[PDB]
Scaffold this active site. Structure first.
Site, PDB file in Angstrom:
ATOM      1  N   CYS A 123      -5.539   2.299   1.371  1.00 43.49           N
ATOM      2  CA  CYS A 123      -6.241   3.197   0.465  1.00 43.49           C
ATOM      3  C   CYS A 123      -6.004   4.630   0.916  1.00 43.49           C
ATOM      4  CB  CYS A 123      -7.745   2.895   0.424  1.00 43.49           C
ATOM      5  SG  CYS A 123      -8.676   3.934  -0.729  1.00 43.49           S
ATOM      6  N   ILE A 147      14.109 -20.810   0.918  1.00 45.40           N
ATOM      7  CA  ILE A 147      12.995 -19.892   0.710  1.00 45.40           C
ATOM      8  C   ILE A 147      11.682 -20.599   1.017  1.00 45.40           C
ATOM      9  CG2 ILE A 147      11.755 -18.526  -0.998  1.00 45.40           C
ATOM     10  CD1 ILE A 147      14.293 -17.236  -0.162  1.00 45.40           C
ATOM     11  N   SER A 194      11.080 -12.343   4.076  1.00 48.50           N
ATOM     12  CA  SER A 194      12.285 -11.805   4.691  1.00 48.50           C
ATOM     13  C   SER A 194      13.439 -11.699   3.705  1.00 48.50           C
ATOM     14  CB  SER A 194      12.703 -12.666   5.892  1.00 48.50           C
ATOM     15  OG  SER A 194      13.796 -12.079   6.578  1.00 48.50           O
ATOM     16  N   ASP A 221       7.896 -10.017  16.615  1.00 49.28           N
ATOM     17  CA  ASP A 221       6.880 -10.026  17.657  1.00 49.28           C
ATOM     18  C   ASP A 221       6.699 -11.394  18.299  1.00 49.28           C
ATOM     19  OD1 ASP A 221       6.101  -7.302  17.618  1.00 49.28           O
ATOM     20  OD2 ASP A 221       4.908  -7.654  15.808  1.00 49.28           O
ATOM     21  N   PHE A 233      -2.920  14.346  -5.351  1.00 51.27           N
ATOM     22  CA  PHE A 233      -2.944  15.218  -4.176  1.00 51.27           C
ATOM     23  C   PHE A 233      -1.893  16.321  -4.264  1.00 51.27           C
ATOM     24  CE2 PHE A 233      -3.696  10.746  -3.098  1.00 51.27           C
ATOM     25  CZ  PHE A 233      -5.043  10.779  -2.797  1.00 51.27           C
ATOM     26  N   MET A 245      -8.268  12.380 -11.100  1.00 45.24           N
ATOM     27  CA  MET A 245      -7.323  11.780 -10.168  1.00 45.24           C
ATOM     28  C   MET A 245      -8.027  10.992  -9.071  1.00 45.24           C
ATOM     29  SD  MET A 245      -6.102  15.589  -9.333  1.00 45.24           S
ATOM     30  CE  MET A 245      -5.341  15.633  -7.716  1.00 45.24           C
ATOM     31  N   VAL A 302     -11.169  23.552  -7.575  1.00 41.22           N
ATOM     32  CA  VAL A 302     -12.099  24.183  -8.506  1.00 41.22           C
ATOM     33  C   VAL A 302     -12.148  23.460  -9.844  1.00 41.22           C
ATOM     34  CG1 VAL A 302     -12.088  26.481  -7.504  1.00 41.22           C
ATOM     35  CG2 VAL A 302     -10.248  25.791  -9.023  1.00 41.22           C
ATOM     36  N   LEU A 322     -15.268  21.304  -2.755  1.00 46.62           N
ATOM     37  CA  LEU A 322     -14.654  20.751  -1.560  1.00 46.62           C
ATOM     38  C   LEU A 322     -13.641  19.680  -1.964  1.00 46.62           C
ATOM     39  CD1 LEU A 322     -17.574  18.726   0.186  1.00 46.62           C
ATOM     40  CD2 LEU A 322     -17.182  18.922  -2.272  1.00 46.62           C
ATOM     41  N   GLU A 357     -10.450  19.662  -0.634  1.00 42.60           N
ATOM     42  CA  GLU A 357      -9.295  20.174   0.091  1.00 42.60           C
ATOM     43  C   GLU A 357      -9.646  20.597   1.507  1.00 42.60           C
ATOM     44  OE1 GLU A 357      -7.261  23.248  -2.536  1.00 42.60           O
ATOM     45  OE2 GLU A 357      -5.545  22.123  -1.759  1.00 42.60           O
TER      46      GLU A 357
HETATM   47  C1  LIG Z   1       5.147  -6.310   5.001  1.00 46.39           C
HETATM   48  C2  LIG Z   1       5.742  -7.097   6.140  1.00 46.39           C
HETATM   49  C3  LIG Z   1       5.292  -6.895   7.422  1.00 46.39           C
HETATM   50  C4  LIG Z   1       5.826  -7.609   8.509  1.00 46.39           C
HETATM   51  N1  LIG Z   1       5.328  -7.355   9.759  1.00 46.39           N
HETATM   52  C5  LIG Z   1       5.837  -8.026  10.759  1.00 46.39           C
HETATM   53  C6  LIG Z   1       5.344  -7.780  12.056  1.00 46.39           C
HETATM   54  O1  LIG Z   1       4.462  -6.962  12.278  1.00 46.39           O
HETATM   55  N2  LIG Z   1       5.892  -8.491  13.094  1.00 46.39           N
HETATM   56  C7  LIG Z   1       6.874  -9.410  12.897  1.00 46.39           C
HETATM   57  O2  LIG Z   1       7.298  -9.997  13.895  1.00 46.39           O
HETATM   58  N3  LIG Z   1       7.373  -9.674  11.668  1.00 46.39           N
HETATM   59  C8  LIG Z   1       6.879  -9.014  10.643  1.00 46.39           C
HETATM   60  N4  LIG Z   1       7.358  -9.254   9.369  1.00 46.39           N
HETATM   61  C9  LIG Z   1       8.436 -10.241   9.167  1.00 46.39           C
HETATM   62  C10 LIG Z   1       7.916 -11.628   8.836  1.00 46.39           C
HETATM   63  O3  LIG Z   1       7.190 -12.154   9.943  1.00 46.39           O
HETATM   64  C11 LIG Z   1       9.081 -12.560   8.490  1.00 46.39           C
HETATM   65  O4  LIG Z   1       9.829 -11.991   7.422  1.00 46.39           O
HETATM   66  C12 LIG Z   1       8.653 -13.974   8.092  1.00 46.39           C
HETATM   67  O5  LIG Z   1       8.036 -14.624   9.204  1.00 46.39           O
HETATM   68  C13 LIG Z   1       9.805 -14.816   7.590  1.00 46.39           C
HETATM   69  O6  LIG Z   1       9.288 -16.088   7.106  1.00 46.39           O
HETATM   70  P1  LIG Z   1       9.421 -16.449   5.548  1.00 46.39           P
HETATM   71  O7  LIG Z   1       8.849 -17.812   5.343  1.00 46.39           O
HETATM   72  O8  LIG Z   1       8.878 -15.319   4.738  1.00 46.39           O
HETATM   73  O9  LIG Z   1      11.014 -16.521   5.369  1.00 46.39           O
HETATM   74  P2  LIG Z   1      11.949 -16.557   4.066  1.00 46.39           P
HETATM   75  O10 LIG Z   1      12.085 -15.170   3.528  1.00 46.39           O
HETATM   76  O11 LIG Z   1      11.434 -17.613   3.145  1.00 46.39           O
HETATM   77  O12 LIG Z   1      13.346 -17.035   4.688  1.00 46.39           O
HETATM   78  C14 LIG Z   1      13.994 -16.222   5.699  1.00 46.39           C
HETATM   79  C15 LIG Z   1      15.153 -16.989   6.283  1.00 46.39           C
HETATM   80  O13 LIG Z   1      14.637 -18.190   6.915  1.00 46.39           O
HETATM   81  C16 LIG Z   1      15.441 -19.286   6.550  1.00 46.39           C
HETATM   82  N5  LIG Z   1      14.622 -20.489   6.657  1.00 46.39           N
HETATM   83  C17 LIG Z   1      13.293 -20.624   6.340  1.00 46.39           C
HETATM   84  N6  LIG Z   1      12.843 -21.838   6.558  1.00 46.39           N
HETATM   85  C18 LIG Z   1      13.937 -22.535   7.055  1.00 46.39           C
HETATM   86  C19 LIG Z   1      14.106 -23.866   7.480  1.00 46.39           C
HETATM   87  N7  LIG Z   1      13.133 -24.773   7.477  1.00 46.39           N
HETATM   88  N8  LIG Z   1      15.334 -24.228   7.921  1.00 46.39           N
HETATM   89  C20 LIG Z   1      16.311 -23.309   7.924  1.00 46.39           C
HETATM   90  N9  LIG Z   1      16.269 -22.034   7.548  1.00 46.39           N
HETATM   91  C21 LIG Z   1      15.039 -21.708   7.120  1.00 46.39           C
HETATM   92  C22 LIG Z   1      15.875 -18.956   5.128  1.00 46.39           C
HETATM   93  O14 LIG Z   1      16.943 -19.753   4.665  1.00 46.39           O
HETATM   94  C23 LIG Z   1      16.224 -17.474   5.293  1.00 46.39           C
HETATM   95  O15 LIG Z   1      17.512 -17.356   5.883  1.00 46.39           O
HETATM   96  C24 LIG Z   1       6.846  -8.555   8.277  1.00 46.39           C
HETATM   97  C25 LIG Z   1       7.299  -8.755   6.963  1.00 46.39           C
HETATM   98  C26 LIG Z   1       6.766  -8.046   5.904  1.00 46.39           C
HETATM   99  C27 LIG Z   1       7.276  -8.286   4.507  1.00 46.39           C
HETATM  100  N1  LIG Z   2      -9.386  10.655  -5.039  1.00 50.28           N
HETATM  101  C1  LIG Z   2      -8.763  11.837  -5.005  1.00 50.28           C
HETATM  102  N2  LIG Z   2      -9.390  12.917  -4.560  1.00 50.28           N
HETATM  103  C2  LIG Z   2      -8.721  14.108  -4.547  1.00 50.28           C
HETATM  104  C3  LIG Z   2      -7.391  14.209  -4.969  1.00 50.28           C
HETATM  105  C4  LIG Z   2      -6.737  13.068  -5.442  1.00 50.28           C
HETATM  106  O1  LIG Z   2      -5.570  13.051  -5.839  1.00 50.28           O
HETATM  107  N3  LIG Z   2      -7.462  11.889  -5.437  1.00 50.28           N
HETATM  108  N4  LIG Z   2      -6.755  15.434  -4.932  1.00 50.28           N
HETATM  109  C5  LIG Z   2      -7.326  16.522  -4.149  1.00 50.28           C
HETATM  110  C6  LIG Z   2      -6.762  17.842  -4.615  1.00 50.28           C
HETATM  111  S1  LIG Z   2      -5.077  18.198  -4.290  1.00 50.28           S
HETATM  112  C7  LIG Z   2      -7.543  18.751  -5.272  1.00 50.28           C
HETATM  113  S2  LIG Z   2      -6.964  20.396  -5.514  1.00 50.28           S
HETATM  114  C8  LIG Z   2      -8.897  18.381  -5.812  1.00 50.28           C
HETATM  115  C9  LIG Z   2      -8.976  18.683  -7.301  1.00 50.28           C
HETATM  116  O2  LIG Z   2     -10.251  18.303  -7.891  1.00 50.28           O
HETATM  117  P1  LIG Z   2     -11.583  19.150  -7.534  1.00 50.28           P
HETATM  118  O3  LIG Z   2     -11.196  20.609  -7.666  1.00 50.28           O
HETATM  119  O4  LIG Z   2     -12.621  18.720  -8.554  1.00 50.28           O
HETATM  120  O5  LIG Z   2     -11.974  18.768  -6.117  1.00 50.28           O
HETATM  121  O6  LIG Z   2      -9.194  16.990  -5.628  1.00 50.28           O
HETATM  122  C10 LIG Z   2      -8.853  16.530  -4.317  1.00 50.28           C
HETATM  123  N5  LIG Z   2      -9.378  15.203  -4.090  1.00 50.28           N
HETATM  124  O1  MOS Z   3      -4.672  22.224  -5.542  1.00 44.04           O
HETATM  125 MO1  MOS Z   3      -4.584  20.413  -5.104  1.00 44.04          MO
HETATM  126  O2  MOS Z   3      -3.772  20.066  -6.747  1.00 44.04           O
HETATM  127  S1  MOS Z   3      -2.467  20.784  -4.156  1.00 44.04           S
HETATM  128  S1  FES Z   4      -5.998   4.272  -3.231  1.00 44.14           S
HETATM  129 FE1  FES Z   4      -8.049   3.527  -2.910  1.00 44.14          FE
HETATM  130  S2  FES Z   4      -9.280   4.731  -4.285  1.00 44.14           S
HETATM  131 FE2  FES Z   4      -7.269   5.624  -4.418  1.00 44.14          FE
END
Ligand SMILES: Cc1cc2nc3c(=O)[nH]c(=O)nc-3n(C[C@H](O)[C@H](O)[C@H](O)COP(=O)(O)OP(=O)(O)OC[C@H]3O[C@@H](n4cnc5c(N)ncnc54)[C@H](O)[C@@H]3O)c2cc1C
Ligand SMILES: Nc1nc2c(c(=O)[nH]1)N[C@H]1C(S)=C(S)[C@@H](COP(=O)(O)O)O[C@H]1N2
Ligand code: MOS
Ligand code: FES
Ligand SMILES: O=C(c1ccc(OCCN2CCCCC2)cc1)c1c(-c2ccc(O)cc2)sc2cc(O)ccc12
Ligand SMILES: O=C(c1ccc(OCCN2CCCCC2)cc1)c1c(-c2ccc(O)cc2)sc2cc(O)ccc12
Ligand SMILES: Nc1nc2c(c(=O)[nH]1)N[C@H]1C(S)=C(S)[C@@H](COP(=O)(O)O)O[C@H]1N2
Ligand code: MOS
Ligand code: FES
Lengths: 1295, 99, 50, 50
Positions: free
Chosen positions: A146, A228, A233, A330, A768, A1008, A1051, A1229, A1231
């Site tokens: 967020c 898959i 991945s 990891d 923003f 916004m 403003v 406020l 900003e």
């Molecule tokens: C947003 C995000 C954050 C992440 N953060 C981390 C993190 O902090 N730390 C970290 O370590 N990793 C991180 N990852 C990576 C994630 O852990 C791996 O991508 C995931 O574990 C892969 O598993 P999957 O089932 O999604 O694989 P898939 O995408 O389904 O497959 C990947 C590969 O595995 C092969 N495969 C799968 N199962 C088998 C099987 N049984 N036999 C043979 N081959 C197989 C597939 O053929 C393919 O080559 C992150 C990924 C994302 C998208």
């Molecule tokens: N949730 C949210 N708050 C926000 C923003 C936004 O994009 N989202 N923009 C900021 C910016 S750049 C400005 S200048 C002001 C504009 O509105 P205000 O003058 O009523 O505070 O909102 C601020 N607060």
């Molecule tokens: O003044 Mo906030 O829209 S940069």
């Molecule tokens: S991204 Fe959470 S309220 Fe805007």
């Protein structure tokens, strides 16, 4: 042949002849018309697409619920499952779910774009845990981002399941009468069909085997096809790295792949198990087994839980993790050192191979055979005298890929304490996970002492070497982490050996013990203080009224720009951007792209002829590149096609030939070296600094760099342009801050009067300042496409291209020379401001002006000379941002005050106090100010935070701990508010009273997320003396309120509120005769009577704007109408061995005046503070020497998550004073709080100083203060030991 | 305005009125249609007076705008409506008016 | 303030597009709100005259 | 090019409404049977005064 059958929100979905490439997120929004699920990044990191997946296991006859990211789910993998979106659990036309009610009523929504993902993450946890702990809820939101709220109100809503809102009025949660799992799915799951399901298209074939025998048969027939499982991945690499697979194998709940065998020597986990399931299995085993046996599982249990969020952990499979072989993995480094074996299987038979270094390096002799699958993995029990540890460091604590991680294991001979076995593995230091097997072999035979540690450090450094050009950058930081983790592993093993065998080993030094504790706190606390006699109860001004769209945010019913339904025959537009920072456009080949399916047209600069340019401010600039490109991300081509998928495919086959041009300028110092053309200087001059430097006791010269910032609005650039078909009329629906500007640039591009083009905005999902300039350029090009082909055209940018095309916050370089007394009084200040402007300069010269006019902050500098310049670089041109130069300029000033404090031997807070403005004082621009609330905010922040007591406790902590340091700091705030001219501050409104008594109001302001529409109706409710339920607002349009200024400058509520107030007072004057004749009557009676007496019930409200002027030649004027005052105190603790840091507590006192809505205003302080905190700490943009923005791996951009929010957060609004000039004595406020985030910056600076002072090193920490910058400032034997490269002997990954 | 175009030419006559009252060509004026969101509480389009009454209302709005601007036209009588409108914005003069 | 009516042009009416037009619009809007859909209602010449 | 009401483009998932009118000038409505009409292709709903 097969059909796809699954359920969404309880309703059955059947698709015949499915396209296997179809993903769940576009399917829900465009096919099923369920636009509650949002797009945020499409990589699984933001969580805006969070949905719930339900499956029925016929073997265990149990229903399983787990969250997932819809953007990575192919719908072909949902056969026999049930999806649940925001719309499924509640709505305003059925029944509001408690999760939706509370996250809205607790003010957990602002822009509301992330709320559907927040709701589904909370809802999915409550289904598994109806009586949960706060730890479970915060863990579920670990992968939810967020940008608006600061997470505090969302956690307040989570706490209710375990003041600004009436908690006692919330609907009670009933675990019964929840959503019933579709009975039909239970039936077809009971009929355990053995048939393999087949889907296909012209491009892809999809096979879903349900038996192990069929899975082995398809692995044989299609050896190169991926298996898959979670697609976490293969999904991202297909989307971002152009990978394509013509055949996909995706098994469905095969029992052999989900085995959990508790063996005698070890335990075996199936490859089909999710990481969340493995986390729960290991968490149970470490409780039922002795500790000497659960060594391997504790290490895996540690890095699980920091691995991504809850959504990805429930999607990703264990086998997929091991086969993927990510370098930043990891888990693989832990498994590499644990003697793990992989159970393989094929049509041939069984096979068992070790999970070693060769396997992780993809050596074919140690890899899987093409026709084999990974069935399960054996992880053995540990022996006595066998110890395993896991370490990692990332940009932030959770949901961020590791810069460097590690896995280490030792085995000691029982009767000599000698190293018998040793295996150390590192990740994120090469293409694959490596093992320091040679250094480990040489350490066999030694004892566990410091002498072995020194030898080990030198050895591994030689073996695990990185080049200066290593991908990912942070080379010296990576080198330090490798031996720093070894030091932690040494201390961990040293402590357990001393505990187990006290007579043979020495005791740990008391100052050294804190290095073994890790920084963590999933416990969150907060307090909110605001104000409240003879005011009418029905008057809502001053009450914490909820955001009008709050409930609609939580139910997914709020319509954002891309949520609008498919208009008939509409087309999609996407852009081909520049891949060079400065080059000639030799040629463009569109022949192939024009002939591809769906392509209607492709436009270049020549196809726009004389409307390719537009005069934004000082000069005309091009929409599309002509013969040159001046940065990456610059628009070159516009591809128009029947669908988004076809448009993106066509854009990639566009061939552009470049020829690089010199010079290639990236940095500010480079821009100064090569700029010999005239540049408009801007200067403030107060007193006489050249004479003042003769009296000062001391003089110092320092500088500080400061990086930019991406807006990261959760809703990307989105617009839908629609021709009416008559008189070239154009309706343009845009997510913008400036409808009047969209009207100008679209009409100018179409050569039309302004009365033919109308811009309509209902709501913006965060901006923003990032949805103004480039938004109009895109809108102008889309509208040109729409008019040319007589079609409505939609343009929505993906997160990657959004960050490239749009700009960010201006990076800054501050250079100061300060002359000061021995007591700390800065009597002379010679300041220089430099802003990295990018390809264009128009936005930047205004941010330099505002930086100079606000650099004083809360300090009276008697003799001051400031100067500023904007600098062109071959980077994306930067735009306005929350703060408008103040977070940069004030950070330069506070950095100078901190350097002055170090020379004179006082705390920065003592120097700030003696340099602060007096109650009545004067600014460098000769404006008189009243700073009583500035002094008060500082006084009450010291009392509320118990600063003097904590200051002693932090010094006490730093004296008893060596490898961990706490830090404390307080900064004051003076945010002036003023637009520079009176015309820039004018606002208008239009109010209708219908004959039934109801009111429709509209104004020029844009919603916004700041809640301006809520405040506008709060105004109408007071001025016309009616409940807020009697007045409604639809949105913003140039057809109802013309010539409206930009929605910015702090403003928007101020000026539109005065205009709305003006229209209401005009109507009340007309109706006063009728009201006096019938005072007991209703508004329906008064309105009908006014109609009968021919009294107009429509009125235009108008405010002329605050008086404002600035003479830059003299350096004097009255530019600001009022000043927002405040002060913030932050306490942190840092890890001197890794650069990690934890925000312990933050206290904020703010002069808001008379808050119109305390819930909205406090939320504006929290969001601005957190947004500023990320700017000064974790948010980091990395560019290559070729000017390319890096975006993969540890270079991924990280905005603050829940783990980054301070553990303790106290916020207080100052008791109000009088501000008769403003609307209801309020102060704009939102900003102002951004700069208060630097209190965390200088708290880290305090802790770093404590370590350097204790270690005898007698400091310039640049922003952002990343773990890289924190670690290297804490110099020790390790930083002095790492190898270093000569500066010019390599081309680095980052600049 | 509140009138409805049924083929009687009321929108043509309305822009004929604006062209006279603001002294500008009809091509500088445009009308989209009729809506309760822009003009509320409008009477029925009937009674043989649709152009009559909405003409007087349109005339009223034009005269209100011409009064506000009069200091600006007399200061720049040779100027265009683009010049007068931009000058009114710079001097904080409202350019919207209910007739 | 929740219901808005927009009219760009009418292909002739002569007083015949007032009362019954609102009755059809009220029933059509009731259908639209009930099923969460936009609803179109165009009469044929025969049923129109009746 | 003039856009009349029915000329407006098909908005997403819009439905159509048509009326069953009276065939008698003054009579009692003793019964209405919708069972067949509700089961026929495309029918979403049928409304009476109730
Ligand atoms: C947003 C995000 C954050 C992440 N953060 C981390 C993190 O902090 N730390 C970290 O370590 N990793 C991180 N990852 C990576 C994630 O852990 C791996 O991508 C995931 O574990 C892969 O598993 P999957 O089932 O999604 O694989 P898939 O995408 O389904 O497959 C990947 C590969 O595995 C092969 N495969 C799968 N199962 C088998 C099987 N049984 N036999 C043979 N081959 C197989 C597939 O053929 C393919 O080559 C992150 C990924 C994302 C998208
Ligand atoms: N949730 C949210 N708050 C926000 C923003 C936004 O994009 N989202 N923009 C900021 C910016 S750049 C400005 S200048 C002001 C504009 O509105 P205000 O003058 O009523 O505070 O909102 C601020 N607060
Ligand atoms: O003044 Mo906030 O829209 S940069
Ligand atoms: S991204 Fe959470 S309220 Fe805007
Ligand atoms: O053999 C030793 C040992 C030898 C000498 C020691 O010296 C004790 C302190 N000494 C006193 C004289 C001056 C120098 C310090 C301690 C342990 C064992 C160990 C050791 C630990 C640390 C180290 O740096 C060197 C050895 S650990 C161990 C485990 C066994 O089962 C048997 C012997 C051992
Ligand atoms: O408020 C302005 C603005 C006002 C006056 C300007 O110059 C007046 C001269 N005029 C400019 C447009 C072309 C014709 C000449 C320029 C920008 C801002 C913009 C603007 C408005 C209208 C338009 O047609 C083009 C750009 S863009 C912008 C971004 C900001 O951060 C702040 C102000 C603004
Ligand atoms: N072409 C055309 N002319 C028309 C009508 C019409 O429906 N179409 N309606 C008539 C009726 S019933 C009336 S009351 C008037 C209304 O418009 P007016 O007052 O501007 O004449 O138009 C008359 N002329
Ligand atoms: O007066 Mo004509 O609308 S019956
Ligand atoms: S997590 Fe899927 S869109 Fe962000």
């Amino acid at each position: 042949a097969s059909e796809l059958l699954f359920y969404v929100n309880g309703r059955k979905v059947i698709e015949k002849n499915v396209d296997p490439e179809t993903m769940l997120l576009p399917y829900l929004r465009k096919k099923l018309r369920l636009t509650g699920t949002k797009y945020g990044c499409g990589g699984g990191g933001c969580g805006a697409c969070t949905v719930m997946i339900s499956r029925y296991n016929p073997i265990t006859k149990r229903i399983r619920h787990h969250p997932a990211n819809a953007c990575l789910i192919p719908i072909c993998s949902l056969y026999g499952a049930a999806v649940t979106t925001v719309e499924g659990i509640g709505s305003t036309h059925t029944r509001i779910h408690p999760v939706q009610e509370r996250i809205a009523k607790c003010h957990g929504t602002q822009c509301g774009f992330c709320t559907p993902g927040m709701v589904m993450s909370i809802y999915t946890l409550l289904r598994n845990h109806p009586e949960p702990t706060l730890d479970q809820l915060t863990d579920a939101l670990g992968g939810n981002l967020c940008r608006c709220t600061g997470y505090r109100p969302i956690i307040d809503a989570c706490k209710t399941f375990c003041k600004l809102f009436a908690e006692e009025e919330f609907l009670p949660l009933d675990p019964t009468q929840e959503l019933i799992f579709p009975p039909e799915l239970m039936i077809m799951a009971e009929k355990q069909s053995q048939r393999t399901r087949v889907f296909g298209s012209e491009r892809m074939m999809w096979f879903s085997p349900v038996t192990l025998k069929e899975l082995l048969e398809f692995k044989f027939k299609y050896p190169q096809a991926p298996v898959i499982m979670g697609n976490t991945s293969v999904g991202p690499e297909v989307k971002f790295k152009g990978v394509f697979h013509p055949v996909i194998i995706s098994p469905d709940r095969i029992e052999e792949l989900s085995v959990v065998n508790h063996a005698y020597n070890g335990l075996t986990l199936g490859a089909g198990l999710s990481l969340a399931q493995v986390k729960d299995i290991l968490a149970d085993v470490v409780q039922k087994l002795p500790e000497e046996k659960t060594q391997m599982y504790h290490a895996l249990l540690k890095h699980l839980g920091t691995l991504a969020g809850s959504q990805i952990r429930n999607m990703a499979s264990l086998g997929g993790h091991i086969i993927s072989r990510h370098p930043d993995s990891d888990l693989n480094p832990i498994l590499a050192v644990g003697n793990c074996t992989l159970n393989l299987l094929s049509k041939e038979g069984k096979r068992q191979i070790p999970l070693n270094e060769q396997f992780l390096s993809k050596c074919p002799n140690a890899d899987l055979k093409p026709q084999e699958i990974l069935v399960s993995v054996n992880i053995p029990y540990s022996r006595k005298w066998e110890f395993v540890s896991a370490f990692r460091q990332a940009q932030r604590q959770e949901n961020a890929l590791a810069i460097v991680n590690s896995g280490m294991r030792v085995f000691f001979g029982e009767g000599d304490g000698i190293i018998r076995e040793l295996c150390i593995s590192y990740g994120g230091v090469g293409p694959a996970t490596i093992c320091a097997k040679n250094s480990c072999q040489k350490l066999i035979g030694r004892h566990w002492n410091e002498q072995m540690l020194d030898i080990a450090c030198r050895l591994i450094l030689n073996e695990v070497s990185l080049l200066g050009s290593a991908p990912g950058g942070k080379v010296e930081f990576k080198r330090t982490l490798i031996i720093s983790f070894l030091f932690k592993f040494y201390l961990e093993v040293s402590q357990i050996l001393k505990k187990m065998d006290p007579v043979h080993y020495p005791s740990l030094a008391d100052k050294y013990e804190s290095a073994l504790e890790d920084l963590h706190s999933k416990h969150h606390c907060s307090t909110l203080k605001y104000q409240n006699p003879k005011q009418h109860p029905e008057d809502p001004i001053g009450h914490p009224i909820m955001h009008l769209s709050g409930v609609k945010h939580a139910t997914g019913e709020a319509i954002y720009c891309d949520d609008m339904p498919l208009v008939d025959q509409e087309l999609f537009l996407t852009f081909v951007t520049s891949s060079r920072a400065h080059a000639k456009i030799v040629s463009i080949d569109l022949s192939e792209a024009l002939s591809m399916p769906g392509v209607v047209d492709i436009m270049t600069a020549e196809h726009l002829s004389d409307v390719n340019s537009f005069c934004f401010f000082t000069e005309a600039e091009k929409f599309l590149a002509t013969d040159k490109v001046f940065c990456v991300g610059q628009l070159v081509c516009a591809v128009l096609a029947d669908s988004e998928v076809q448009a993106k495919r066509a854009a990639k086959r566009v061939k552009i030939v470049y020829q690089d041009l010199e010079p290639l300028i990236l940095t500010i110092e480079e821009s100064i070296q090569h700029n010999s053309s005239f540049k408009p200087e801007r200067k403030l001059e107060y007193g006489n600094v050249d004479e003042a430097f003769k009296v000062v006791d001391q003089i110092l010269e320092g500088e500080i760099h400061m990086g930019g910032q991406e807006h990261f609005y959760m809703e990307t650039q989105s617009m839908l342009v629609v021709p009416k078909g008559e008189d070239q009329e154009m309706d343009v629906y845009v997510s913008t801050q400036f409808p009047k500007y969209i009207q100008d640039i679209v009409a100018s591009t179409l050569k039309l009067p302004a009365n033919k083009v109308m811009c309509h905005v209902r709501r913006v999902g965060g901006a923003f300042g990032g949805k103004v300039l480039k938004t109009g350029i895109i809108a102008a090009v889309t509208a040109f496409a729409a008019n040319k082909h007589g079609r409505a055209v939609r343009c929505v940018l993906e997160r990657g291209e959004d960050m490239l095309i749009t700009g960010g916050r201006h990076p800054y370089l501050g250079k100061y020379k300060a002359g000061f007394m021995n007591d700390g009084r800065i009597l002379a200040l010679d300041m220089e401001h430099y802003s990295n402007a990018g390809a264009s300069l128009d936005e930047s010269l205004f941010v330099i002006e505002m930086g100079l006019l606000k650099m004083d902050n809360a300090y009276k500098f008697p003799n001051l000379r400031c100067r500023g310049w904007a600098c062109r670089t071959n980077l994306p041109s930067n735009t306005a941002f929350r703060g408008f130069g103040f977070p940069q300029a004030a950070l330069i000033t506070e950095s100078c005050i901190t350097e002055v404090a170090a020379k004179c031997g006082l705390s920065p807070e003592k120097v700030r106090i003696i340099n602060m403005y007096k109650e009545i004082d004067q600014t460098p621009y000769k404006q008189e100010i009243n700073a009583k609330n500035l002094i008060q905010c500082w006084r009450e922040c010291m009392a509320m935070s118990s600063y003097s007591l904590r200051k002693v406790a932090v010094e006490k902590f730093n004296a008893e701990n060596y490898w961990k340091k706490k830090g404390l700091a307080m900064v004051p705030l003076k945010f002036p508010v003023g637009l520079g001219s009176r015309a820039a501050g004018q606002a208008a409104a239009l109010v209708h009273i219908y004959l039934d008594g109801s009111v429709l109001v509209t104004h020029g302001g844009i919603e916004m997320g700041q809640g301006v529409h809520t405040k506008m109706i709060q105004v109408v409710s007071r001025e016309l003396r009616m409940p807020m339920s009697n007045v409604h607002l639809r949105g913003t349009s140039t057809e109802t309120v013309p010539n409206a200024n930009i929605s910015g400058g702090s403003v928007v509520a101020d000026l539109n509120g005065l205009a709305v107030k003006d229209a209401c007072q005009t109507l009340l004057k007309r109706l006063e005769p009728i009201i006096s004749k019938n005072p007991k009557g209703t508004w329906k009676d008064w309105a009908q009577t006014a109609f009968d007496e021919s009294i107009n019930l429509s009125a235009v409200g108008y405010f002329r704007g605050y008086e404002s002027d600035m003479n830059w030649e003299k350096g004097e004027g009255q530019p600001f109408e009022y000043f927002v005052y405040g002060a913030a105190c932050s306490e942190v603790e840092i890890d001197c061995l890794t650069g990690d840091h934890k925000n312990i507590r933050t206290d904020i006192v703010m002069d808001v005046g008379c808050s119109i809505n305390p819930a909205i205003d406090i939320g504006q302080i929290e969001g601005a503070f957190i947004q500023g905190m990320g700017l000064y700490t974790i948010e980091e943009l990395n560019y290559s020497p070729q000017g390319i923005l890096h975006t993969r791996g540890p270079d991924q951009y990280k905005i603050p998550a829940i783990c980054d929010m301070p553990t303790e957060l106290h916020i207080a609004l100052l008791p109000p004073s009088q501000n008769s000039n403003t609307l209801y004595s309020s102060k704009g406020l939102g900003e102002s709080g951004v700069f208060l985030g630097c209190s965390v910056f200088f708290a880290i600076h305090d802790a770093v100083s404590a370590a350097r002072q204790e270690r005898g090193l007698h400091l310039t920490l640049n922003s952002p203060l990343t773990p890289e910058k924190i670690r290297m400032a804490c110099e020790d034997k390790f930083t002095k030991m790492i190898p270093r490269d000569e500066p010019g002997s390599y081309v680095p990954w980052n600049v």
